[PDB]
Design an enzyme around this catalytic site. Structure first.
Site, PDB file in Angstrom:
ATOM      1  N   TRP A 250       0.817  -1.215   0.000  1.00  0.00           N
ATOM      2  CA  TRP A 250       0.000   0.000   0.000  1.00  0.00           C
ATOM      3  C   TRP A 250       0.854   1.270   0.000  1.00  0.00           C
ATOM      4  CZ3 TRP A 250      -0.694  -4.213   3.206  1.00  0.00           C
ATOM      5  CH2 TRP A 250      -1.845  -4.976   2.964  1.00  0.00           C
TER       6      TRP A 250
ATOM      7  N   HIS B  83      -7.001   1.572   2.241  1.00  0.00           N
ATOM      8  CA  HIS B  83      -8.015   0.551   2.016  1.00  0.00           C
ATOM      9  C   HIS B  83      -9.062   0.718   3.093  1.00  0.00           C
ATOM     10  CE1 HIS B  83      -5.349  -2.426   4.580  1.00  0.00           C
ATOM     11  NE2 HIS B  83      -5.342  -1.192   5.054  1.00  0.00           N
TER      12      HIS B  83
ATOM     13  N   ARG C 208      -4.229   6.037  -2.636  1.00  0.00           N
ATOM     14  CA  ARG C 208      -2.915   5.426  -2.763  1.00  0.00           C
ATOM     15  C   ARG C 208      -2.045   6.249  -3.695  1.00  0.00           C
ATOM     16  NH1 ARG C 208      -3.661  -1.132  -3.113  1.00  0.00           N
ATOM     17  NH2 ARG C 208      -5.451  -1.272  -1.676  1.00  0.00           N
TER      18      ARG C 208
ATOM     19  N   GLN D 269     -13.344   0.744  -2.569  1.00  0.00           N
ATOM     20  CA  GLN D 269     -13.312  -0.664  -2.196  1.00  0.00           C
ATOM     21  C   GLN D 269     -14.610  -0.982  -1.473  1.00  0.00           C
ATOM     22  OE1 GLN D 269      -8.609  -1.795  -1.349  1.00  0.00           O
ATOM     23  NE2 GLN D 269     -10.045  -1.584   0.373  1.00  0.00           N
TER      24      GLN D 269
ATOM     25  N   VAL E  36      -5.141 -11.808   7.712  1.00  0.00           N
ATOM     26  CA  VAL E  36      -5.908 -13.049   7.570  1.00  0.00           C
ATOM     27  C   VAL E  36      -5.028 -14.276   7.462  1.00  0.00           C
ATOM     28  CG1 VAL E  36      -8.038 -12.168   6.662  1.00  0.00           C
ATOM     29  CG2 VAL E  36      -6.153 -12.611   5.100  1.00  0.00           C
TER      30      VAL E  36
ATOM     31  N   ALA F 195     -13.309 -12.167   6.356  1.00  0.00           N
ATOM     32  CA  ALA F 195     -13.442 -10.830   5.808  1.00  0.00           C
ATOM     33  C   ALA F 195     -13.021 -10.951   4.359  1.00  0.00           C
ATOM     34  CB  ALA F 195     -12.521  -9.845   6.545  1.00  0.00           C
TER      35      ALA F 195
HETATM   36  N1  LIG Z   1      -8.319  -4.170   1.678  1.00  0.00           N
HETATM   37  C1  LIG Z   1      -7.302  -5.091   1.077  1.00  0.00           C
HETATM   38  C2  LIG Z   1      -7.990  -6.268   0.360  1.00  0.00           C
HETATM   39  C3  LIG Z   1      -8.432  -7.330   1.368  1.00  0.00           C
HETATM   40  C4  LIG Z   1      -7.658  -8.527   1.557  1.00  0.00           C
HETATM   41  C5  LIG Z   1      -8.065  -9.508   2.512  1.00  0.00           C
HETATM   42  C6  LIG Z   1      -9.247  -9.308   3.293  1.00  0.00           C
HETATM   43 CL1  LIG Z   1      -9.724 -10.520   4.469  1.00  0.00          CL
HETATM   44  C7  LIG Z   1     -10.035  -8.138   3.125  1.00  0.00           C
HETATM   45  C8  LIG Z   1      -9.637  -7.155   2.174  1.00  0.00           C
HETATM   46  C9  LIG Z   1      -6.408  -4.275   0.075  1.00  0.00           C
HETATM   47  O1  LIG Z   1      -6.487  -3.015   0.089  1.00  0.00           O
HETATM   48  O2  LIG Z   1      -5.650  -4.905  -0.703  1.00  0.00           O
END
Ligand SMILES: N[C@@H](Cc1ccc(Cl)cc1)C(=O)O
Ligand SMILES: N[C@@H](Cc1ccc(Cl)cc1)C(=O)O
Lengths: 266, 266
Positions: free
Chosen positions: A65, A94, A120, A134, A177, A230
């Protein structure tokens, strides 16, 4: 006698932005599955945007990011329970930090989906933006398993591409995760796999962060004996595929000849 | 220089009818639970309105609905699969016949909610109409139990009256369900039990009617090894309690001073 085929008073005719339509449809898709939509702040704390999500500094994973760092005083960033938090300010990279905010402010089980503008530092081309959207998903509760994450996305696909659609999951990495995963949906028309978003089972350290922050605020632990999944997906890339938009730069371009084209859509 | 506190162009301001708002809210409540809304025809066949629902003639149970019988030819009443059905015409006395139509036209499992205008030959007073609205519910599928009907209504209540709300079920009779039941929800504010609607586990004979009609149309049986629950609730009585309307006769009264009062509401 009157020429009834004659133009009438020019009352203005409104319209909704492509992203709004796409976001709406997405939110409806999940509302039907029991998800509720909530939002978070665009300006965030490094703690919520990174640390709380198991993404420390100088970490190779934090390079996923490109952050816009902010400066200036007098600004009051408010935390989950309305309290006045601190930390280095930045534009959220995000919507994920919101699943931490929501969790310290509520108790399981629950289902949420959080749409939102993200930022970003990146070079703007035909299929790349520095400012996009998102849609996060977070379902926590006792007994929640990865079989449920897979069912959710399966439902997402069906709802988005019809009965001949299908999902695919491949292991991918995310500090928040474990197991982690990336998913793609089959698009019968264009006949190809669209990589939609990442997902996975919430990370142990994320739950610990939430409960620790809760203690610091006087609330009792609420995520000790629950699991959860998630997911997160880019909105423009999907809106483009769906509405047939050739250049991602149009969305924030503000051109009427462009926007006016979506009045019909729903 | 301009008197900016001066009235502006009198562009008209629209509004939605009380029943629409109430119906909408109801439909949203159930959409979140995975229910989808579909409608049926106001003019029906005695077969769909009664017979198919296990309510024969000269039956004491058929007295529960005062029917408006219709006459005249040239009218084409169309069945579930678009085909041209027959039977004595009448104005539907409840939305229930629609759960038969839907079932012969689809396969389980599924969740539907069907709102609709219903008619009954009755004397119009302050809390009684001959023309009102109901909202049916029907969830069929393998393994569906009465514990689920109770959970649905529990969810309905919570969504309608808050965390201090609660449901109550008492055995009641309906030819199309067994077990049959009537349910009331606790209204914390007015502090009293509101009898909302009836419900129960779909009747064996209703499933048989559906599959028999299916055969006659060339479709294969689809409800042999599934169970299900249905429910039905009067809309006006709830809209009145909710919007604080004193006279049920207002809804179809068409008075603007009345209707205009609901522009704000959502
Ligand atoms: N918000 C993450 C994408 C994402 C990945 C895994 C989970 Cl569990 C949730 C969202 C991103 O900006 O790449
Ligand atoms: N539609 C019925 C109410 C009802 C009773 C039972 C069930 Cl399962 C569904 C609806 C009536 O008009 O009284």
């Amino acid at each position: 006698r009157v020429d009834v085929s004659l133009p009438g008073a020019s009352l203005f005719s409104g319209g909704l932005h492509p992203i709004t339509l796409m976001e709406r449809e997405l939110v409806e898709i999940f509302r039907a599955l029991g998800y509720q939509a909530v939002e978070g702040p665009e300006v965030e704390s490094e703690f919520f945007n990174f640390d709380a999500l198991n993404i420390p500094e100088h970490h190779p994973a934090r390079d996923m990011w490109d952050t816009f760092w902010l400066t200036g005083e007098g600004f009051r960033l408010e935390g989950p329970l309305g309290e006045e938090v601190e930390g280095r300010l930045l534009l959220r990279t995000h919507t994920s930090p919101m699943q931490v905010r929501y969790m310290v402010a509520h108790t399981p089980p629950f289902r949420i989906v959080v749409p939102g503008r993200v930022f970003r530092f990146e070079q703007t081309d035909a299929t790349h933006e520095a400012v996009f959207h998102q849609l996060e998903g977070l379902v926590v509760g006792e007994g929640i398993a990865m079989a449920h994450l897979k069912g959710a996305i399966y439902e997402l696909a069906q709802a988005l591409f019809g009965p001949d659609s299908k999902v695919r999951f491949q292991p991918v990495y995310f500090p928040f995760v474990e197991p982690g995963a990336q998913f793609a949906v089959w698009w019968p028309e264009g006949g190809k796999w669209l990589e939609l978003g990442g997902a996975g089972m919430v990370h142990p350290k994320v739950f610990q962060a939430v409960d620790a922050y809760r203690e610091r605020l006087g609330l009792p632990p609420a995520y000790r004996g629950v699991t959860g999944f998630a997911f997160g997906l880019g909105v423009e890339r999907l809106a483009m595929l769906r509405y047939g938009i050739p250049d991602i730069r149009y969305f924030f371009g503000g051109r009427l000849k462009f926007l006016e084209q979506f009045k019909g859509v729903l």
